[PDB]
């Protein structure tokens, strides 16, 4: 379907968009006490894999799944909350602020770099077709 | 012997396309952490050789092989990510973004130059075919 | 034919006892040019199909080569016809 460069750069754009979405969702839920069921929000992470279609030669980036972080959930002593345990510590998400802003900046700069790569390739693509005519 | 220019410039175009593809693959995976085998993505680069069989004076260019770039793997301290080292040193690819962008630009320019060579050569072949007429 | 095979064995006997052309060359040139054009067209259709491994560079270069070969054939035909007309114009 897609040309190889198109597929690689578009996969890069989609992967960076997914990472930015995960960062934004984490930054929104930084102060959430409960979900829809009664469990604390867990910071999400996105794992980049190389989609090496040929044997070890090249390939874009794919995202296998969005994993839930395994870090000590923040404990805040609020015994009056219905979600407090026997000891009374309500669970707040493990979303760090600085890491998510850094992730947003990095995802934006990778997105823009891949955009520039596509823009650069495009002129050569259109100029290839003048070879025959 | 203007026909050999077709082969020379076509080989050059294919080699520059392969180089641009490899550079874009490296750039799109600068943020990757995992490969299909779990290994960290290693930045790769093509090798250019003169496409001359033994006894041939000058030919085009050919891609001998794709080799892993020689650079220290970028160590990141994240001993919370499921992928880690003994001391929590996540290994990230050694992609130098500026180098890859410059490589993409250079490959595009060389590609366009070879296209111009092919165009003017075809024009000359037609004019030669209109020798006496 | 049965008589045709008789003639074949007769020509084999002739070879036993005994012990390419301009039209052929023109036919060979036409076949070569047509085969090149068909190869370029087939590769172009394969690329348009979406099958992997076919590069636009090769498609465009092969179309270029096929066009050059067609033009060469056209020029050869033009001259050949001109020479035939010149010969037939000779007064005997």
């Amino acid at each position: 379907a897609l040309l190889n460069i198109f597929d690689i750069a578009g996969s890069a754009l989609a992967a960076q968009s997914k990472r930015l979405n995960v960062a934004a969702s984490n930054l929104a839920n930084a102060d959430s006490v409960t979900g829809p069921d009664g469990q604390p929000y867990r910071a999400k992470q996105v794992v980049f894999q190389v989609d090496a279609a040929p044997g070890q030669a090249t390939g874009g980036v794919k995202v296998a799944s969005v994993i839930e972080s395994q870090a000590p959930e923040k404990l805040v002593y609020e015994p009056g909350n219905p979600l407090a345990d026997a000891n009374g510590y309500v669970k707040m998400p493990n979303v760090d602020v600085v890491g998510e802003m850094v992730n947003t900046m990095s995802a934006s700069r990778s997105y823009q770099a891949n955009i520039e790569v596509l823009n650069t390739v495009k002129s050569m693509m259109l100029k290839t077709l003048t070879l025959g005519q | 012997a203007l026909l050999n220019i077709f082969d020379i410039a076509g080989s050059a175009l294919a080699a520059q396309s392969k180089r641009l593809n490899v550079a874009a693959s490296n750039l799109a995976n600068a943020d990757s952490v995992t490969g299909p085998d779990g290994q960290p993505y290693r930045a790769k680069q093509v090798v250019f050789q003169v496409d001359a069989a033994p006894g041939q004076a000058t030919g085009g260019v050919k891609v001998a092989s794709v080799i892993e770039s020689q650079a220290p793997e970028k160590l990141v301290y994240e001993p919370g990510n499921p992928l880690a080292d003994a001391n929590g040193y996540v290994k990230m690819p050694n992609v130098d973004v500026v180098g890859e962008m410059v490589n993409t630009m250079s490959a595009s320019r060389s590609y366009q130059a070879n296209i111009e060579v092919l165009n003017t050569v075809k024009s000359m072949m037609l004019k030669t075919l209109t020798l006496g007429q | 034919a049965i008589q045709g095979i008789e003639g074949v064995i007769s020509q084999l006997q002739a070879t036993a006892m005994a012990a390419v052309s301009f039209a052929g060359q023109l036919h060979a040139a036409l076949d070569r040019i047509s085969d090149r054009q068909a190869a370029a067209r087939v590769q172009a259709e394969k690329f348009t199909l979406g099958e992997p491994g076919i590069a636009l560079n090769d498609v465009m270069a092969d179309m270029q080569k096929a066009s050059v070969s067609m033009q060469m054939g056209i020029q050869v035909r033009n001259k050949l016809v001109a020479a035939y007309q010149e010969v037939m114009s000779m007064q005997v």
Partner: peptide, 13 residues
């Protein structure tokens, strides 16, 4: 060969 060109159709068919 091992590396497909940038202007080739997705290796993944």
């Amino acid at each position: 060969g091992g590396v497909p060109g940038a202007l080739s159709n997705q290796p993944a068919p």
